[PDB]
Amino acid sequence: NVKKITKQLTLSLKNPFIYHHVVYGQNVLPGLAYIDIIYQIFREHGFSCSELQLRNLSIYQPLTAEQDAVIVLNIQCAEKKEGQWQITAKGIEKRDGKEASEEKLYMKADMHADSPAIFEETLDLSQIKASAQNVVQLDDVYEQCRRQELVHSEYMKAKGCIYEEEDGVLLELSLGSEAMLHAEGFMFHPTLIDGSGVGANHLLTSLLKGEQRLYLPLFYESFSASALLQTDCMTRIKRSSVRREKELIYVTLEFFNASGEKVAELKNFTSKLV
Numbered sequence: 001n002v003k004k005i006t007k008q009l010t011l012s013l014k015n016p017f018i019y020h021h022v023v024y025g026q027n028v029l030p031g032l033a034y035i036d037i038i039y040q041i042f043r044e045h046g047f048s049c050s051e052l053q054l055r056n057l058s059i060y061q062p063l064t065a066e067q068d069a070v071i072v073l074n075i076q077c078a079e080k081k082e083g084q085w086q087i088t089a090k091g092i093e094k095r096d097g098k099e100a101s102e103e104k105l106y107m108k109a110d111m112h113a114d115s116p117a118i119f120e121e122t123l124d125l126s127q128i129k130a131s132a133q134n135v136v137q138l139d140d141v142y143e144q145c146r147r148q149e150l151v152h153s154e155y156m157k158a159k160g161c162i163y164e165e166e167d168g169v170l171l172e173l174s175l176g177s178e179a180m181l182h183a184e185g186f187m188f189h190p191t192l193i194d195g196s197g198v199g200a201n202h203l204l205t206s207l208l209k210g211e212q213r214l215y216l217p218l219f220y221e222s223f224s225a226s227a228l229l230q231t232d233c234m235t236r237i238k239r240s241s242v243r244r245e246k247e248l249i250y251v252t253l254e255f256f257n258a259s260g261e262k263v264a265e266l267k268n269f270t271s272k273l274v
Contacts, residue, residue, distance in 0.1 A: 005077040020156035029063040031217030033190035054223040057109035083113035121262035132163040158195025171199035174232035221268035
């Protein structure tokens, strides 16, 4: 029924992800929020998350807003071949200040309607905790972010802790009380997904060789999901998936429900040094 889907978003400091996510003092839509954005759009046209695979998402620049400026973000999904959409998100900044500015490319991606997303992997969660060598509370990791001038507050700060071992990390993530109140309308909650990125970056620390400049999202190879991630998740990051190559870091995020079943994966989440 759809060949061309468009959605216009008005992004400003009224948006709680932008207001509560500050990078080198600028309010920024977390790049990991695009997953929710895109899956909302297809859902509105009848697609279940399990029908789709998001592929080759690229971020061209951060989506930033200051003061009262509004970014009017036009998302077009165009069905190039059957079950294959090219997505582009381009925005114009409206203010006063000075009125509408020139159109900028923020993100592009592909969405494939082929293939149902199914996962067989399960985990014995308690076991994994019991075998943990150290537990890091997540507030302490957000403490470190703030020292590197990345500041999540309130709605944007996940709750939980990181279970560390030689082989990887397990992130026990849930919404804070303010975001929890509104979790029901999300598909892949940006706080859960961003928090998982923050956990990944904590496992990358040794490979970072003391570097303090932030790494922002650049590229996602794929995202696939058999169920929504709304209130909580268990995220595993395997050391074998994480690497640094000069200016670029790579990780693979595996999402599990509270019962331990694998329900999503972000493969080769790539970020780039600022």
